[PDB]
Amino acid sequence: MKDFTTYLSTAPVVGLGWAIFTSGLLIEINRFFPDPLVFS
Amino acid sequence: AHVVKIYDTCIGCTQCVRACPLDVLEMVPWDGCKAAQMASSPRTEDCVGCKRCETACPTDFLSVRVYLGNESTRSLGLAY
Amino acid sequence: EIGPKRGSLVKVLRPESYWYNQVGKVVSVDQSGIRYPVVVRFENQNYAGVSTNNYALDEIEEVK
Amino acid sequence: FPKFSQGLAQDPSTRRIWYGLATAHDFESHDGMTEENLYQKIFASHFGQLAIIFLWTSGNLFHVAWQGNFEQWVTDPIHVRPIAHAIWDPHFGQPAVEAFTRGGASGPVNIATSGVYQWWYTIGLRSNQELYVSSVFLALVSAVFLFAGWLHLQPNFQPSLSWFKDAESRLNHHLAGLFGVSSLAWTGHLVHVAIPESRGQHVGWDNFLSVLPHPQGLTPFWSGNWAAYAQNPDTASHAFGTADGSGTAILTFLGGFHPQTQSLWLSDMAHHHLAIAVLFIVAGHMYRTNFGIGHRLEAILEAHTPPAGGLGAGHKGLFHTVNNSLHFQLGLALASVGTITSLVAQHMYSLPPYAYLAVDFTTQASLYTHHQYIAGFIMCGAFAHGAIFFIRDYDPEQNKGNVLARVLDHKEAIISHLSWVSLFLGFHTLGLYVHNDVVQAFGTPEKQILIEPVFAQWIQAAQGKSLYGFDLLLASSSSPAYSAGQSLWLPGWLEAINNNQNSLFLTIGPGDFLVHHAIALGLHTTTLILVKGALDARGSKLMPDKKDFGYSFPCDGPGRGGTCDISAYDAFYLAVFWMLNTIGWVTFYWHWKHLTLWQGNVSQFDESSTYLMGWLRDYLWLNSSQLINGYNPFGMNSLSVWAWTFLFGHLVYATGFMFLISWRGYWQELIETLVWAHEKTPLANLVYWKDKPVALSIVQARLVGLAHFSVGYIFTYAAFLIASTAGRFG
Amino acid sequence: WPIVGQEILNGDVGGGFQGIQITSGFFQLWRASGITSELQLYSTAIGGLVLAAACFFAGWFHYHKAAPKLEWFQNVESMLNHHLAGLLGLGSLAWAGHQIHVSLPV
Amino acid sequence: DIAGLTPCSESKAYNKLERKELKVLDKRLKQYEPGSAPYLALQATKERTENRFKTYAKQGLLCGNDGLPHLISDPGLALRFNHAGEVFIPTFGFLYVAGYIGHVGRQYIILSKEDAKPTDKEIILDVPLALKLAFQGWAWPLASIQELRNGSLLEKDENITVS
Amino acid sequence: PWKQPELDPDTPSPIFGGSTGGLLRKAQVEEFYVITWESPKEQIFEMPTGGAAIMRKGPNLLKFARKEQCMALTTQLRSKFRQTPCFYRVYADGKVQYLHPKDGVYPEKVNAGRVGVNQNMRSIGKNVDPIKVVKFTGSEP
Numbered sequence A: 001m002k003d004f005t006t007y008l009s010t011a012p013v014v015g016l017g018w019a020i021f022t023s024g025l026l027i028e029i030n031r032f033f034p035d036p037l038v039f040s
Numbered sequence B: 001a002h003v004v005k006i007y008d009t010c011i012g013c014t015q016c017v018r019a020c021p022l023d024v025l026e027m028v029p030w031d032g033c034k035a036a037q038m039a040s041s042p043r044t045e046d047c048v049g050c051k052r053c054e055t056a057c058p059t060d061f062l063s064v065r066v067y068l069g070n071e072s073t074r075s076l077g078l079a080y
Numbered sequence C: 001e002i003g004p005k006r007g008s009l010v011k012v013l014r015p016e017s018y019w020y021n022q023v024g025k026v027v028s029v030d031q032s033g034i035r036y037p038v039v040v041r042f043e044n045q046n047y048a049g050v051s052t053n054n055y056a057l058d059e060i061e062e063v064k
Numbered sequence D: 001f002p003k004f005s006q007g008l009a010q011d012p013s014t015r016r017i018w019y020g021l022a023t024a025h026d027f028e029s030h031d032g033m034t035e036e037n038l039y040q041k042i043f044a045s046h047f048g049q050l051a052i053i054f055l056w057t058s059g060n061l062f063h064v065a066w067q068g069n070f071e072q073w074v075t076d077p078i079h080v081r082p083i084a085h086a087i088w089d090p091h092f093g094q095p096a097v098e099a100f101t102r103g104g105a106s107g108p109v110n111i112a113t114s115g116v117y118q119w120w121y122t123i124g125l126r127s128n129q130e131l132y133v134s135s136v137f138l139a140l141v142s143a144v145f146l147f148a149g150w151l152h153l154q155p156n157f158q159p160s161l162s163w164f165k166d167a168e169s170r171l172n173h174h175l176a177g178l179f180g181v182s183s184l185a186w187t188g189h190l191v192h193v194a195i196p197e198s199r200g201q202h203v204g205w206d207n208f209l210s211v212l213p214h215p216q217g218l219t220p221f222w223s224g225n226w227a228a229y230a231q232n233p234d235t236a237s238h239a240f241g242t243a244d245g246s247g248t249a250i251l252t253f254l255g256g257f258h259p260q261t262q263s264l265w266l267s268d269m270a271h272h273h274l275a276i277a278v279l280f281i282v283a284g285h286m287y288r289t290n291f292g293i294g295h296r297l298e299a300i301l302e303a304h305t306p307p308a309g310g311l312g313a314g315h316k317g318l319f320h321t322v323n324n325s326l327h328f329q330l331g332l333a334l335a336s337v338g339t340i341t342s343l344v345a346q347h348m349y350s351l352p353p354y355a356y357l358a359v360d361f362t363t364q365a366s367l368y369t370h371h372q373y374i375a376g377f378i379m380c381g382a383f384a385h386g387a388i389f390f391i392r393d394y395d396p397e398q399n400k401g402n403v404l405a406r407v408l409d410h411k412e413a414i415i416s417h418l419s420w421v422s423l424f425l426g427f428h429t430l431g432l433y434v435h436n437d438v439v440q441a442f443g444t445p446e447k448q449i450l451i452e453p454v455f456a457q458w459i460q461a462a463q464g465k466s467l468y469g470f471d472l473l474l475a476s477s478s479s480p481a482y483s484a485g486q487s488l489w490l491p492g493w494l495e496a497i498n499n500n501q502n503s504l505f506l507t508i509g510p511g512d513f514l515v516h517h518a519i520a521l522g523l524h525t526t527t528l529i530l531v532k533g534a535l536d537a538r539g540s541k542l543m544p545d546k547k548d549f550g551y552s553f554p555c556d557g558p559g560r561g562g563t564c565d566i567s568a569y570d571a572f573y574l575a576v577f578w579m580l581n582t583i584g585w586v587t588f589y590w591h592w593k594h595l596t597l598w599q600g601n602v603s604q605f606d607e608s609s610t611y612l613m614g615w616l617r618d619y620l621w622l623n624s625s626q627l628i629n630g631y632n633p634f635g636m637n638s639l640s641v642w643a644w645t646f647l648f649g650h651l652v653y654a655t656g657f658m659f660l661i662s663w664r665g666y667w668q669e670l671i672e673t674l675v676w677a678h679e680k681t682p683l684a685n686l687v688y689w690k691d692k693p694v695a696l697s698i699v700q701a702r703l704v705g706l707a708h709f710s711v712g713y714i715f716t717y718a719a720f721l722i723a724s725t726a727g728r729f730g
Numbered sequence E: 001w002p003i004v005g006q007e008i009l010n011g012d013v014g015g016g017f018q019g020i021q022i023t024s025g026f027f028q029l030w031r032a033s034g035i036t037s038e039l040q041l042y043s044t045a046i047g048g049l050v051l052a053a054a055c056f057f058a059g060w061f062h063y064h065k066a067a068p069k070l071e072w073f074q075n076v077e078s079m080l081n082h083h084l085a086g087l088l089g090l091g092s093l094a095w096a097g098h099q100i101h102v103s104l105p106v
Numbered sequence F: 001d002i003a004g005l006t007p008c009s010e011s012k013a014y015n016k017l018e019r020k021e022l023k024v025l026d027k028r029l030k031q032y033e034p035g036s037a038p039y040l041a042l043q044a045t046k047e048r049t050e051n052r053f054k055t056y057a058k059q060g061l062l063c064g065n066d067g068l069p070h071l072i073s074d075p076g077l078a079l080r081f082n083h084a085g086e087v088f089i090p091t092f093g094f095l096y097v098a099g100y101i102g103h104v105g106r107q108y109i110i111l112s113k114e115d116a117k118p119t120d121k122e123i124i125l126d127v128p129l130a131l132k133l134a135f136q137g138w139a140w141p142l143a144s145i146q147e148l149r150n151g152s153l154l155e156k157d158e159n160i161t162v163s
Numbered sequence G: 001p002w003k004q005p006e007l008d009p010d011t012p013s014p015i016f017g018g019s020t021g022g023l024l025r026k027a028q029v030e031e032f033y034v035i036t037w038e039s040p041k042e043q044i045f046e047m048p049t050g051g052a053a054i055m056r057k058g059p060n061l062l063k064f065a066r067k068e069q070c071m072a073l074t075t076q077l078r079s080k081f082r083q084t085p086c087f088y089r090v091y092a093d094g095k096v097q098y099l100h101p102k103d104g105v106y107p108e109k110v111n112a113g114r115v116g117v118n119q120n121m122r123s124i125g126k127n128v129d130p131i132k133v134v135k136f137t138g139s140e141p
């Protein structure tokens, strides 16, 4: 398990979790309060 | 007709001599290094300007440099 | 003793070198009158892949 | 064959022939050279380029007078098309001569695009006889210069080195005589000849002594009443040829354009080149030359050293650096000439100086594009020739502590900041274009990020444009800047700038905003590619001694991870691609914004230039309809020559991709195989080459492929620019 | 899905349905065989996942647990007979059966 | 108003563009049945489109002769004429986020280089440390001026040069 | 060596059917190279130009058009079969020159007789700028 967690700490995997967060956050930020252009 | 100059930083590795195919580099004794060897370039008329030697040199910067210049039949590697 | 101490870090002053104004460990020093006795080892590689090079007394100075 | 170089002559291959041409006019590297013989060979060669210029101009005059319609054009300048030179191609067919004979002339012809008809007509040429007389004049002047390049090379008449390195005398003679007196005389021509020719009077060598330019003569000039020459200017209802609506003025400050010929007033341009003559003669008497008075150049540079030491020693040591380095002097001249060439492009389309040029839509384009393309080529040379200075003619110990060494010391900061500007400009410009490409595509054209260029509209309001409503000083009647120059220039200037049917300060929108930002990205990155090749010319960490090798070399080998395209020549090589890309955008933006103006539908550019598909749909694909149908299977129009050239460019551009992508090693093994066949064949083996065949060198291919690349990048657009604009006639 | 823009891609294809128009020819392939309902496609998908895991399991088994020797690989003559008769021969004979009993009667 | 631009509420082309974009959906809506899912999808797009246009008008945007909204960048005109949310306020929002990425990556680089084998820490990250710094960077401007005023931000001629 | 070995132009060659990588018109006109070596048994080796050939027990001789073609073969024989080849240079005039083991000892081993050539007594870099030698040839010499 120590080696599995180490594999998960590689660059390709940590980047995959980052991408799901940033993309998931932005798509969710467009789904709610739809299509923003001016900021109030 | 290329130019091959070796500088003061040689350490007598002989890797330049083993690499260059055309036998343009040989080892000569010297008192400057631990190995008591230094390179030389007696026959540059046979230099094809491949520049493999410079790659062999394992110093911070090259103690062997092949300054390209005027061409010839032997330098251009022409079988014809 | 002729030169810096074993295991001592020093800063390089060759303008030609990849390691210029950079620090490296002194691996050894020869006291037989050689022009470039001081052997130095760095962690970072150069462009070729070599991490050591023999420098001179005047070309090296104290760290930082 | 190269006598100037023995090293290449001993070469047995074809590399001798190629390198013999390219190193021909590089006098420094020649064998047995001397600094004194260098300047003399240059001085003689510079006479040559004059000889080709004056002959090239003589050829246009003759070929126009003999074959053109200059006499017919002046009578109806708007409708009649000019004629450049006739055609004799025996490979034509009968439909082609019937199509290419569109002009009034009998045989087929080529319609002109330069604009020389509008220029010659303005300065007072109204006959073909006067062009014949002129073509002889320049051909004589051309022969005189050839005789001088030979004469000033002889044992006698051979200038010494001290004569060349006399900067103070060259400035005074060239600023006062070449610039000033020439500008003074051109005013003498506009007054004594051209303005009369506009107002009907025929002035020539027969009658220029008897005819007065002004009724009063010179008595106002001596008395001091210099305002008498500006009393009765030409009226608005004035035909450019006849005396209807004429005046007596020769020097005036009306400002603005002439109504009929949308062009600058001749009396203004006459007044212009006069004042330029005065400043330039005054500036000519500045430096010291064989008399006690005058400034010295070296004393000035040594003095302008700031005390605190922000620049160290300052400008010390630079005089001997500039005066002895020819590459330094050449970079500054190209830098200055390159920039000026862009001004000529930017200031002519907005301020037409010639008669009936605003109406000739095809002619305005070509001239603007030709000057802009040359601007980039000249600018690239200034850096490149600036990089050679650092290798050959730079001495660090002499130039120690000065501005030139202090720049070269911290170059890592300059190249870093330049890179950041290009990255930020490139990422944001591409992003805005993409964001609008998509959001248009999903049917929502209101979600676009359209930012108004407020800072530029602030200027046009501060220069007379009342559309935006900023109400700045010169758009406000109460301000003093409106009060001053109210009697002089503003009534004519305010009328033109506020007119939205001319190219003087066109309306700006958010589409013009993105195009300007895209340009900035190209200009900053192009400089970064060049600046790097200059500052890192002396050395890099990968190659601490580039200076020992030269400006142009292959590479330092596959060692140290790879050193292909390090030399400063390879930086110039890569910048030309960007240069063409930058001028392309600059020129694509000029053409479309003007087509929409000429077609009347300005809304085409404002709405569609905000997203990239508009550029591909509305500008490229749409205006390439009449052109592509130049030779149809049914028939052929007069635009067939342009469609043929259209493809000719598309092809030459692709052939360069071979020399760029495919390198040498694939080919030399191939030529070795053909050599085997030529010797083993029974009868062909009897024939044997004198020089051995080998593939082209590495640096040669970079050059050759760039030529095939740039020629296609010019011949393609020139056809598209002329055909699109000529077929619509608007 | 329905996000910013995007939905317009779900064009009016026809059949009480809107989506991206494909150009793979799967629909004509599934009709050449006897396929009238969607239930036949679901099973066909679950079979692939079952066989695919078997394939993946095999690669771990044939390498990590029980891996053949070089002698097994050099039995090239054996491979040709099994690949020709077994895979291409019976494979084609099998398909004929399905076409005769399903692809033709449907 | 400013720069000869009309507000989007008063513009005619702005409403013309609304009537156009809705007409496309109404024509597309005629094909399908009322209670079907394609009908619900298009009605939602109709609802979003009607909301996009009214919100941009309510926000005091400026529409040109073409009928599309334009943005203003100078903070003086933005604040004077109430157009600050367009560009001037988006600039501060981004800089806080951009600085956060820099202050975080700079700290992970410095701290891993204080230990043995920093090369391995780049390809194989210390995720507990990276998350710690990522949640400690909310006040990145304070630390920067703290590090600038102190002098431990910049290095001093201990860097490699080339000549 | 003790003495330069003169060329024996009549020695048996390897068993090689022939190829197209052989000699061209340059060889008869300008120069060509020949290599000699002595093998203890009959073996197979790769030629630089072409394919495989069979050596012969005893002396062997080849003819090549380039020095690299010859030295490429020495590196193969010295490594694979551990032999000691020696090759010459033959001009069109018939003159012969003994090249590679010119001292008898291979260049990668020192010998007292050798004298240094093209030896600069300075560090790389640390040399004058091109401006100092602007009007004659050479910054490195």
Ligand code: CLA
Binding pocket: D021, D022, D023, D024, D025, D026, D027, D334, D377, D378, D380, D381, D382, D384, D388, D551, D572, D707
């Ligand atoms: C006042 C103008 C001026 C002057 C006096 C010089 C003078 C010189 N330049 Mg310079 N240069 C200039 C402008 C100028 N240049 C500009 C504007 C640029 C930017 C493009 C350059 C770029 C430049 C480079 C990059 C180099 C020089 C070099 C040189 C030196 C001579 C090289 C030589 O003999 O080449 C002779 C070369 C030729 C005869 C070949 C030119 C062939 C051209 C490219 C083909 C053109 C296409 C074809 C004809 C099109 C036909 C159309 C077809 C359809 C029919 C000499 C000091 C060289 C130098 O100093 O080396 C150290 C050098 O490397 N110059």
Ligand code: CLA
Binding pocket: D123, D124, D125, D130, D133, D134, D135, D137, D141, D144, D182, D185, D186, D188, D189, D192, D193, D203, D204, D205, D206, D207, D208
């Ligand atoms: C910038 C100066 C300048 C320029 C470019 C022109 C240009 C022109 N003039 Mg003009 N002119 C000028 C000044 C100038 N003028 C001045 C100051 C006057 C007042 C006297 C006139 C009075 C005048 C008249 C009255 C006429 C012209 C005409 C002409 C046209 C034809 C000239 C021709 O074919 O050569 C013909 C040349 C000669 C007959 C001999 C010229 C003798 C001078 C002194 C030689 C100068 C050579 C000069 C030094 C060359 C430079 C190279 C140098 C190194 C050798 C041409 C557009 C004629 C025309 O039809 O225009 C509409 C015409 O009839 N001009």
Ligand code: CLA
Binding pocket: D651, D652, D654, D655, D656, D657, D658, D661, D662
């Ligand atoms: C439109 C661009 C272009 C053109 C014209 C060519 C042309 C050619 N390529 Mg390239 N190729 C290209 C793009 C192009 N390629 C690019 C960008 C790449 C990069 C991958 C490659 C990579 C490449 C490789 C690696 C090789 C080729 C080969 C060839 C040659 C094949 C022999 C042949 O068919 O010639 C026939 C002649 C023509 C096709 C020219 C057609 C135009 C007409 C016929 C010429 C008219 C002449 C005219 C009448 C005379 C006027 C004289 C005038 C001075 C008066 C040929 C010359 C092969 C080769 O050279 O070996 C055989 C080779 O192996 N190509």
Ligand code: CLA
Binding pocket: D429, D430, D433, D515, D518, D519, D521, D581, D584, D585, D586, D588, D612, D615, D616, D620, D621, D624, D628, D649, D650, D653, D712, D713, D714, D715, D716, D717, D718, D720
């Ligand atoms: C395989 C088919 C093919 C190919 C390979 C080409 C290739 C080429 N065409 Mg072409 N063309 C084709 C088909 C093809 N065409 C067809 C079918 C037509 C219609 C019949 C045309 C009509 C056409 C025209 C009218 C023109 C070309 C041009 C060109 C050349 C421009 C290359 C370049 O990099 O310039 C530079 C590329 C650009 C500047 C970008 C392309 C246009 C962009 C979208 C404009 C954006 C400008 C603006 C500032 C935004 C960019 C900024 C950015 C930061 C976002 C190029 C070699 C042009 C040319 O001759 O070269 C000068 C030219 O004017 N083509």
Ligand code: CLA
Binding pocket: E023, E024, E025, E026, E028, E029
């Ligand atoms: C990345 C590679 C690739 C991809 C993405 C695709 C994608 C596609 N293929 Mg294709 N195919 C490929 C490679 C690829 N193919 C190659 C290299 C071949 C040469 C053998 C074929 C032969 C092929 C055929 C004959 C057909 C497709 C079809 C299709 C389409 C339907 C997919 C499907 O499941 O049909 C499934 C296919 C079948 C049910 C019939 C397969 C019959 C072949 C002949 C079986 C041969 C297998 C055999 C054991 C392997 C060769 C033996 C060896 C000795 C050569 C689809 C768009 C079908 C189509 O057109 O769609 C409508 C179609 O008929 N493919």
Ligand code: CLA
Binding pocket: D416, D417, D419, D420, D423, F101, F102, F103, F104, F105, F106, F108, F125, F130, F133
């Ligand atoms: C902490 C990481 C980091 C930091 C603090 C910086 C900081 C800086 N960079 Mg930079 N850079 C980085 C990573 C970083 N960079 C990476 C990974 C690359 C390779 C793509 C580059 C490539 C690069 C170039 C080409 C340039 C800079 C430049 C600059 C300077 C101006 C800002 C800029 O526009 O850069 C550009 C910004 C980018 C290219 C985006 C970088 C990619 C992401 C957004 C950042 C990486 C964050 C990291 C992966 C997260 C790790 C966090 C950790 C806890 C796990 C600036 C001081 C410019 C300069 O020289 O200054 C004058 C410049 O020209 N950088």
Ligand SMILES: CC1=C(C/C=C(\C)CCC[C@H](C)CCC[C@H](C)CCCC(C)C)C(=O)c2ccccc2C1=O
Binding pocket: D658, D659, D660, D662, D663, D664, D667, D694, D695, D696, D697, D698, D700, D701, D702
């Ligand atoms: C095709 C090709 C060759 C070989 C091309 C050759 C040998 C063609 C040159 C010789 C022909 C006969 C000249 C053709 C004539 C020209 C059309 C006109 C030349 C005009 C000048 C005399 C001014 C290279 O040597 C080469 C080298 C490096 C990178 C790429 C390449 C490359 O792509």
Ligand code: SF4
Binding pocket: B004, B019, B020, B021, B022, B023, B024, B025, B046, B047, B048, B049, B050, B051, B052, B053, B054, B066
């Ligand atoms: S250039 Fe090539 S052949 Fe000549 S000495 Fe160097 S490596 Fe050997």
Ligand code: SF4
Binding pocket: D554, D555, D556, D557, D558, D562, D563, D564, D565, D663, D698
């Ligand atoms: S230019 Fe060619 S030979 Fe030189 S390093 Fe690059 S790929 Fe290798």
